[PDB]
Structures are given as structure tokens and as C-alpha cells.
Design a protein around this ligand. Structure first.
Ligand code: NA
Length: 419
């Protein structure tokens, strides 16, 4: 079927990009290409990223408005509380697994290789309640410091979409529309139509996705000066990250799903393999959001009013893979600096990763800034982050799957809470 063809092409795009980038690097790489040729070579990946960033606003906002307006406020409140508990518990488990898998199997046992913590959470709270809806569509509040030599924190809005604030506003506005009654039907229909129109565009973009992924991966592995040396240096770190992701996705989340529902979790995952493949290929949660919702509603028995509400929220708040990656990177850096971590600092890492996972922006910087916040919370050198980013093109992808799987299973849990 053409859905299977698209999934196969999207997955094979990563392998083809890896091969193309290795060939280009072995044929001189960027120095042989030069800046002008390299920019054109990597441009298609940038085009794909721009296309994927375009859809996030209308898709998420309309989906959340519809999902919130399609449920009784009391039932919506109970469902949201349970979903938040599930997301927090899963993120905490991912962080704990990441820390445990790095203290053992030490990735940094070789010699080859800012905002205050309170101010970061105050900025998170400010972004949860945007001061302007139009501005929130492309800017987020951020605090810098001015010396008066007291470092007073002064804040301003800086580039970067405010997804968390818009999500909160969409949920509240949908609740208000539901409470209006027959007067709010027109707006519910309007936002549903907008959501369907946006999903059509997302489906069209999925066809160009493989070509963008090709050049994205090729350029991002051409930027590495030495593939062999870098991989020999970060082999154990990548092993820790991917092993933690595999353990969390294949053992922990399925175990929780079985314990609570007592149905087969792998039969559930078999119905969403296609969204998982799209997530791995594109590294975008919004890209798989429509396909994930379709598969969950059709292949699985999840009710529409459950999926349309839970999945858009999880795509923004549930970042198990990101938390695991951040904790593994923090332990790796702490081992590189030979700065022994005691129980207090381990708990600090866990709590900071869990708390900062909420509001992790969709941009690539959103998964590495939180790492800087964690390092500051524990007092680690940020200089080493250069290494961590160098393999994001792989690790981030592994994160994205774990960032969506936990969402789908989450819905699968709440369905049983409703049954
Ligand atoms: Na997610």
C-alpha cells in the first residue's frame, strides 16, 4: 500500500542520507565542496524543517480546541489529571533509567574526549500564561541579567514559538466553547474544518519528507570533521542513549500498559509502527500527530475525543526520550570532568530534567538548552556540549520515537479508564 511505501521511503531516507554523507566526506567533504556548494547541498533539509515548523501552530491549536470542546469539563479535568500524572511518572522513569544506565556502563571513562535555576522556572511559568496571543505565536519570554554589581533579572520576548502557552490557551478556550453551549457550535465546526485542512497539507508534506531527510542527514554528517574518530569517541555515549531508549520503549512503557490495562502492549505498538517510523524519519512530533491520531483511532479502539485531546498535549509535554537523553548527557559530562555526583546531585538532575522537559520547544535547541539548565543546576562545564550535539542527527531521532510512543500508549491507558 502507498502508506507502507511512504513509510519505507521515509525510513530508507536516513540510510541513503548516511551513505551520501559518507561518500561526500570521503570525497573531500566541506572543504572540497566549499561554502557555496555546501549551502545548496544542505538546503533541502532546511526546506523540510521550515515546512514542518509551519504546520505546528494551526494543527496543534485547532486540535486542542476541538479536543477540549468535545468533552465534559469534569471528565476533561479527570482525563487531563490522569494524563499529566502518567506523563510525569514516565518522564521520571526515563530520567532515572538514563542516570542508572550512565553511572553503570560509564560512557565518559576515557581521556580521548546562564539563567539561574529559579529564573528558568519563572520563565516557564510566564510562558505557560502568554501576555499576547499574536506574539506568543513566534516569541517566548526569556530572562537576561543586568548589573546595577547586583545581577538583576530583566526579561524580554525572544524568537521562538510559545507552544506551551498556546496549548494552554487552546485547552481553556475549548473548555469555554463547550461551556457556551449551542452558541459555541459554530466555532467548534470552524476549528475542526481548519484542523482537517491542515492535516491535508501535512499529508502532502509527508511526500516531500524523504527528500528533505536525505539531505538533512547527509549535511549533518558532512559537518563532522572525522566520522571514525568522532564515533570511536562517542560510541559508548550513543550506546547508553540508544540502549536506554530501547529499554524504556520496549520494556518499561509496555510493562506499565500491561499492568494497568492487562491487554497486549505489543499488539498496540504494531498498530502505530507507521507513526513510529515517521517519527524516526522526520524527528518531528507534529509530523506524526495526524498519522498517529489516525492509527490510534482506527487500528486501536481509542475513542476520538480521547486521542484528539491527549495526543496534542503529550506531543508538547511528554518528552521521555528527551529527558533520558538529557540525563545521560549530564552524567557523561560529569564523568568527563571527573566531577563525582552524589545522591543530592543525582536527585537534582532527575528533578530538573523532569521539570524542564515541560515546555521543551520543538526547535532542535529545545532539547539541548534544557541540558545547559541541568548542567548549571549541578554546576558542570557547558563546553562539552559541542560533542553531544555532534551526533544529534541520530540521537534526537531515537528520542522522537520515544517522544511519541509514550503518548500513544498513554491514550491507550486512558481509554481503559473510560471503559
Ligand atoms: Na511527546
Amino acid at each position: 500500500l502507498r502508506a507502507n511505501l511512504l513509510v519505507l521511503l521515509t525510513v530508507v531516507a536516513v540510510v541513503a542520507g548516511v551513505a551520501l554523507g559518507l561518500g561526500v566526506s570521503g570525497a573531500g567533504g566541506a572543504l572540497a565542496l566549499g561554502p557555496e556548494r555546501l549551502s545548496a547541498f544542505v538546503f533541502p533539509g532546511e526546506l523540510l524543517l521550515r515546512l514542518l515548523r509551519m504546520i505546528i501552530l494551526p494543527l496543534v491549536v485547532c486540535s486542542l480546541i476541538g479536543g477540549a470542546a468535545s468533552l465534559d469539563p469534569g471528565a476533561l479535568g479527570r482525563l487531563g489529571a490522569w494524563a499529566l500524572l502518567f506523563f510525569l511518572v514516565t518522564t521520571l522513569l526515563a530520567s532515572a533509567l538514563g542516570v542508572g544506565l550512565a553511572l553503570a556502563l560509564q560512557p565518559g571513562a576515557a581521556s580521548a574526549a546562564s539563567k539561574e535555576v529559579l529564573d528558568s522556572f519563572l520563565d516557564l511559568a510566564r510562558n505557560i500564561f502568554p501576555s499576547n496571543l499574536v506574539s506568543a505565536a513566534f516569541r517566548s519570554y526569556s530572562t537576561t541579567y543586568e548589573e546595577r554589581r547586583v545581577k538583576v533579572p530583566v526579561g524580554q520576548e525572544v524568537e521562538g514559538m510559545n507552544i506551551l502557552g498556546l496549548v494552554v490557551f487552546a485547552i481553556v478556550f475549548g473548555v469555554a466553547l463547550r461551556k457556551l453551549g449551542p452558541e459555541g457550535e459554530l466555532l467548534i465546526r470552524f476549528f475542526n474544518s481548519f484542523n482537517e485542512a491542515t492535516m491535508v497539507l501535512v499529508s502532502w508534506i509527508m511526500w516531500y519528507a524523504p527528500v528533505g531527510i536525505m539531505f538533512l542527514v547527509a549535511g549533518k554528517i558532512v559537518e563532522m570533521e572525522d566520522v571514525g574518530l568522532l564515533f570511536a569517541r562517542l560510541g559508548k555515549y550513543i550506546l547508553c542513549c540508544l540502549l536506554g531508549h530501547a529499554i524504556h520503549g520496549l520494556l518499561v512503557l509496555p510493562l506499565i500498559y500491561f499492568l494497568f490495562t492487562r491487554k497486549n502492549p505489543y499488539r498496540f505498538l504494531w498498530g502505530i509502527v507507521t507513526p513510529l517510523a515517521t517519527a524516526f524519519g522526520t524527528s518531528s512530533s507534529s509530523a506524526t500527530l495526524p498519522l498517529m491520531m489516525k492509527c490510534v483511532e482506527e487500528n486501536n479502539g481509542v475513542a476520538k475525543h480521547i486521542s484528539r485531546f491527549i495526543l496534542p498535549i503529550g506531543a508538547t509535554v511528554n518528552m521521555d526520550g528527551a529527558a533520558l537523553f538529557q540525563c545521560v548527557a549530564a552524567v557523561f559530562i560529569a564523568q568527563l570532568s571527573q566531577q563525582s555526583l552524589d545522591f543530592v546531585k543525582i536527585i537534582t538532575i532527575l528533578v530538573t530534567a523532569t521539570a524542564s522537559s515541560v515546555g521543551a520547544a520543538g526547535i532542535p535547541a529545545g532539547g539541548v538548552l534544557t541540558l545547559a539548565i541541568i548542567l548549571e543546576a549541578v554546576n558542570l562545564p557547558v563546553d562539552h556540549i559541542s560533542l553531544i550535539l555532534a551526533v544529534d542527527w541520530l540521537v534526537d531521532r531515537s528520542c522522537t520515537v520515544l517522544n511519541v510512543e509514550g503518548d500513544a500508549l498513554g491514550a491507550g491507558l486512558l481509554q481503559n479508564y473510560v471503559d
